């Protein structure tokens, strides 16, 4: 009963709220979430992620309610609210700069180069390439950001995000933990579902049982180590 | 204008969900929240706290959305869900036991003795008595619970809770940070608004600007120090 032809991609206008998350931004750009990116609740996110990507309520409720903390409203956010550093938003992003040394909100092609150039010799990104990218992005933050934060929690969130692009933008079974570069690149660079390019919503549900072993393997292959205090404390609201 | 005659106290039935919070339990017991204690949203908490206690949306949105993390639902909790240790629920409670060594959910008269016996020779509890109680309760946990968690965050939450009973159950201006023992005792022991005893909803709004100096003073007088790592990390959801 979901009609993708009734969900065309449209570029956001200058006052349409967009955040640091390509997943939610893409849903908004197709009208699965409000195109203005505002007044978004967790039930709305659950429905949009199901309809758009076949992502299940388990992960979207867990992440969604943490995301709600970033606004001043009782039960909604704007997508831009999610840029709040140290709730979910973190250093060593795949396509954004660290907030201490740049723009933690907008897609940045220079940052994205690392991901774009990963898995040489193949037309997919996969678990080993995803891990290499995480290793390299963290190394970049440690090199260049004097305020870098790197904890078990940020590392887990980062692997979760890599698992998302490998699964949601997959061509075959999302279980395989690989996704066409052509699909993933459109997802990040244009925050668009690559429909003309051949992408289709997964027919396999993407939930925590599916993602968990992928996340853990990405972490394992990334050669991640604690670097500092390692306290997994999140920011509980804006303006504290 | 709030009609308290239309909000009578009724004892919870066997299937009514109740949690570790006397504030929310009392609102449920008067039907300001659903008497069954289920499917409770942050907007419902905001409205109930305003109507019942004149507590404003600043504190209830902030605390409410953190409380939402304790359930598996998109935008509601059951009151019992709030017992989840390490989200809001903490050791050295005023009226509950530490989860590692007892029941962190139900009112416990033996624990409550410390509060009940505080401020000898006055008919109010006040900021100095509240601080002494927090000191003594923490000392008890440090003595008897080898797994005690005691951090900047838990200390702040604890002082916030003491500030709540001093203000919401006040007779005079809540600014004064003192409340009749007869009112506070009914609040904890029966999770009832002490209307027959003479209590009335504050005509002064109770918000973060009002609570903040009370919180800080309680902490200052309590001779507080952190335990161990002093890591302000919360549990982000159940079953992790
Ligand atoms: C469930 C609700 C969601 C919330 C609240 C959320 C929130 C966020 C936030 C705050 C970030 C920024 C982290 C950072 O890079 O600093 C982010 C990144 C990301 N999210 Fe989401 N997200 C959600 C769902 C999704 C979904 C459904 C996808 C699907 C593919 C997704 C894919 C991503 C990816 C790939 C990134 C990494 C961007 C980068 O590192 O540059 N997210 N998310
Ligand atoms: C006017 C509103 C409220 C009042 C007056 C109030 C009052 C209190 C008090 C006095 C305690 C301490 C109980 C003790 O130490 O034995 C407490 C504990 C608690 N409250 Fe509230 N509360 C209010 C709102 C909230 C809200 C909105 C939430 C979350 C949605 C919440 C969650 C809790 C939790 C989880 C505890 C347990 C902490 C612990 O003792 O371990 N409260 N509350
Ligand atoms: C936000 O959404 C709620 C729920 O649908 C609605 O009642 C409210 O009017 C909306 N506000 C705006 C500004 O659109
Ligand atoms: C990822 O693809 C590369 C190149 O095809 C391959 O060498 C590597 O084994 C793959 N890793 C996984 C986990 O499939
Ligand atoms: C960031 O690091 C610099 C250099 O160490 C330091 O002066 C500054 O206080 C830090 N800022 C934050 C946000 O901690
Ligand atoms: C209400 O909470 C119950 C658990 O108490 C949960 O099963 C249900 O999905 C929630 N939703 C509704 C429809 O009330
Ligand atoms: C609390 O009451 C006691 C006894 O009346 C008094 O000694 C003490 O100074 C009071 N403290 C405050 C903060 O008012
Ligand atoms: C296995 C744990 C995954 C959930 C981590 C906490 C919530 C953050 C959501 C991660 C997804 C995202 O950030 O896009
Ligand atoms: C300013 C840091 C506090 C962050 C919010 C956590 C919960 C606030 C405590 C509210 C009182 C209560 O738990 O009943
Ligand atoms: C319930 C905890 C929330 C905040 C507790 C610590 C700060 C005191 C209140 C904030 C005062 C203010 O700046 O308006
Ligand atoms: Mg980031
Ligand atoms: Mg407790």
The token pair that represents A23 in the structure block = 């997943």
Separation of alpha carbons A125 and B63, rounded Å: 41
Separation of alpha carbons A20 and A105, rounded Å: 5
Which ligand sits closest to the CA of A34?
A: 3
Experimental method: X-ray
Select from B87, B94, B139, B208 the least CA-distant residue to A239.
B208
Looking at ligand 1, which residue's alpha carbon is closest to its atom 27? A23
Beta carbons of A65 and B61 less than 8 Å apart: no
Structural resolution in Å:
1.6
Nearest CA in chain B to A231: B231
Which ligand sits closest to the CA of B189?
A: 2
- To probe the interface with A, which of B74, B157, B215 has the most A CB atoms within 10 Å? B74
Domain B17-221, classified CATH 3.40.50.150, yes or no: no
Select from A85, A42, A35, A84 the least CA-distant residue to A61.
A42
Give, in order, the Cα–Cα distances in Å from A232 to each of A83, A142, A151, B116: 18, 18, 6, 36
Identify whether the C-beta of residue B221 lies closer than 8 Å to the C-beta of residue B127: yes
Separation of alpha carbons A132 and A119, rounded Å: 9
Separation of alpha carbons A104 and A101, rounded Å: 9
Nearest CA in chain A to B231: A231
Separation of alpha carbons B237 and B240, rounded Å: 7
Q: Any bridge partners for residue B89, and if so which? A: B85
Beta carbons of B75 and A42 less than 8 Å apart: yes
Separation of alpha carbons A117 and B51, rounded Å: 58
The token pair that represents B120 in the structure block = 């000898």
Give the Cα-Cα-Cα angle B21, B22, B28 (nearest 5 degrees): 95
- Centre of ligand 9 to C-alpha B160, Å, is 6
- CATH level 2 (architecture), domain A15-221: Orthogonal Bundle (1.10)
A68 neighbourhood in chain B, CB within 8 Å = 65, 68
Nearest CA in chain A to B152: A233
Identify whether the C-beta of residue B65 lies closer than 8 Å to the C-beta of residue A69: yes
The answer, for A36 touching chain B at a CB cutoff of 8 Å, is: no
B178-180 and B124-126 strand pairing: antiparallel
In sequence order, the 6+-apart residues with CB closer than 8 A to the CB of A210 are A167, A174, A175, A204
Which ligand sits closest to the CA of B23?
A: 2
- Centre of ligand 2 to C-alpha B92, Å, is 13
In sequence order, the 6+-apart residues with CB closer than 8 A to the CB of B21 are B79, B82
Separation of alpha carbons A44 and A38, rounded Å: 11
The answer, for A100 touching chain B at a CB cutoff of 8 Å, is: no
The token pair that represents B136 in the structure block = 């003594």
Separation of alpha carbons B86 and B235, rounded Å: 5
């Amino acid at each position: 009963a979901v009609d993708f032809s009734a969900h065309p991609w449209k570029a956001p206008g200058p006052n349409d709220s967009r955040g640091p998350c390509p997943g939610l931004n893409t849903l908004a750009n197709h009208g699965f979430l409000p195109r203005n990116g505002r007044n978004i609740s967790v039930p709305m996110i659950v429905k949009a992620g199901f309809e758009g990507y076949n992502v299940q309520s388990d992960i979207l409720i867990l992440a969604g309610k943490v995301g709600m903390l970033t606004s001043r409203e009782a039960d909604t956010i704007s997508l831009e609210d999610l840029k709040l550093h140290g709730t979910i938003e973190h250093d060593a992003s795949l396509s954004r700069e660290d907030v201490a040394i740049g723009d933690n909100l907008h897609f940045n092609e220079a940052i994205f180069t690392t991901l774009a150039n990963s898995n040489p010799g193949a037309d997919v990104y996969n678990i080993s390439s995803a891990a290499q990218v995480q290793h390299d992005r963290l190394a970049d933050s440690v090199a260049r950001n004097p305020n870098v934060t790197n904890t078990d929690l940020t590392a887990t969130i980062r692997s979760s995000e890599s698992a998302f692009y490998l699964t949601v933008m997959s061509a075959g079974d999302p279980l395989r933990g690989e996704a066409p570069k052509k699909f993933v690149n459109v997802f990040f660079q244009e925050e668009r579902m690559p429909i003309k390019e051949g992408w289709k919503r997964s027919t396999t549900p993407i939930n925590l049982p599916l993602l968990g072993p992928i996340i853990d393997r990405i972490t394992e292959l990334s050669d991640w180590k604690p670097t500092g205090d390692n306290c997994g404390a999140i920011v509980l609201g804006p303006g504290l």
